[PDB]
């Protein structure tokens, strides 16, 4: 995969959004370290600019969201424990910066 820029869709349970994923699943990736950069994350800025009730942002097929699960993490740096997700948590000002989109 490679850092890329996509147009995300929103989910919520405004009607530009779709209903939420019925089976959100978080897949960890063994080993696997990714660099996150808060200062150059074009997902995150389009996200908060677009912003009960939560709104999730989601990737179309061909892209995936990596999530940082590290306990050190503050938006920028190597992340040692990473997950791939199809959508963010429900957002109700990051973070938020624990996410980046990549292309498969």
């Amino acid at each position, epitope marked *: 995969w490679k850092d890329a820029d996509t147009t995300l869709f929103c989910a919520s349970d405004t009607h*530009a959004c779709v209903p939420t994923d*019925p089976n959100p699943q978080e897949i960890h990736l063994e080993n696997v370290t990714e660099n996150f950069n808060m200062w150059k994350n074009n997902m995150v800025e389009q996200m908060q600019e677009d912003v009960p009730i939560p709104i999730h942002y989601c990737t179309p*097929a061909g892209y995936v969201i990596l999530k940082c699960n590290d306990k050190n993490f503050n938006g920028t740096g190597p992340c040692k424990n990473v997950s791939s997700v199809q959508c963010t948590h429900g957002i109700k000002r990051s973070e938020l910066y624990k996410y980046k989109v990549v292309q498969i």
Partner: antibody, heavy 123, light 110 residues
Framework: EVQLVESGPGLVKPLETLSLTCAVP????????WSWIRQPPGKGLEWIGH????????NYNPSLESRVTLSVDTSKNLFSLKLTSVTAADTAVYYC????????????????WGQGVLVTVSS | SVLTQPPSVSAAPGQKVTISCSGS????????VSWYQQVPGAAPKLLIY???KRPSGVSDRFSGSKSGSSASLAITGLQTGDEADYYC???????????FGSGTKLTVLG
């Protein structure tokens, strides 16, 4: 209510190309999937294909794939369908629909539909 | 190439009915099922998504489920407003298509 209005010729000659247009909400075209679906009079539904509003992601019904092209014109908020070499079997009401797809979960459905347009194929 | 539904389902007003939808493990077996309600001459509308979830405006007289490679739509308190053609649908993860069912006309017996 997401308003979708399909357009095109009511009548097309056999072996010509059918072209249809679906007009969409601006604040949504780029950030959703959109499908075409058809229904010959008195018969059932058939999914034609879908296309993400920005991708880079198009999926066609495998049986119509050779004849089908879908396009998104974000500027004029048009979702379009071209279908080549039409026959008597392509007479149908054609619908555009906003599509919800979470590929990793296996859910794919149509939550807002336009009103449909009849295309009759006759020489 | 369609998921199999009965052509006709009917009952007197106020009765309960069910509509079956059978397919195979590459569709209903592995994917979520949706149901659509169509008055002839009008577009379908979404009735059920994610197998058993109702969109706004759909009453709880309508419920969906699935078992193995068959799905089912149960309707209680049958009434005039429910008379329509009903279609199930589901993604096929092997063929990569949305496959619709063959359609069922629901009649309230008058």
């Amino acid at each position: 209510e997401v308003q979708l209005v399909e357009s095109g010729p009511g009548l097309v000659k056999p072996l010509e190309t059918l072209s249809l247009t679906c007009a969409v909400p601006g604040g949504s075209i780029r950030r959703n999937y959109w499908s075409w679906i058809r229904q010959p009079p008195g018969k059932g539904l058939e999914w034609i294909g879908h296309s993400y509003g920005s991708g880079g992601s198009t999926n066609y019904n495998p049986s119509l794939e050779s004849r089908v092209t879908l396009s998104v014109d974000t500027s004029k908020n048009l979702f379009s369908l071209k279908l080549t070499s039409v026959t008597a079997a392509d007479t149908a009401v054609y619908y555009c629909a906003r599509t919800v797809w979470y590929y990793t979960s296996g859910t794919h459905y149509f939550d807002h539909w336009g009103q449909g347009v009849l295309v009759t194929v006759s020489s | 190439s369609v998921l199999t539904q009965p052509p006709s389902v009917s009952a007197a007003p106020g009765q309960k009915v069910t509509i079956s939808c059978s397919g195979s493990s590459s569709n209903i077996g592995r994917s979520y099922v949706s149901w659509y309600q169509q008055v002839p001459g009008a577009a379908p509308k979404l009735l059920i998504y994610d197998t058993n979830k109702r969109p706004s405006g759909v009453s709880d007289r309508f419920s969906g489920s699935k078992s193995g490679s068959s799905a089912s739509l149960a309707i209680t308190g049958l009434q005039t407003g429910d008379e329509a053609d009903y279609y199930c649908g589901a993604w096929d993860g092997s063929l990569n298509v949305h496959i619709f069912g063959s359609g069922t006309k629901l009649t309230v017996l008058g």
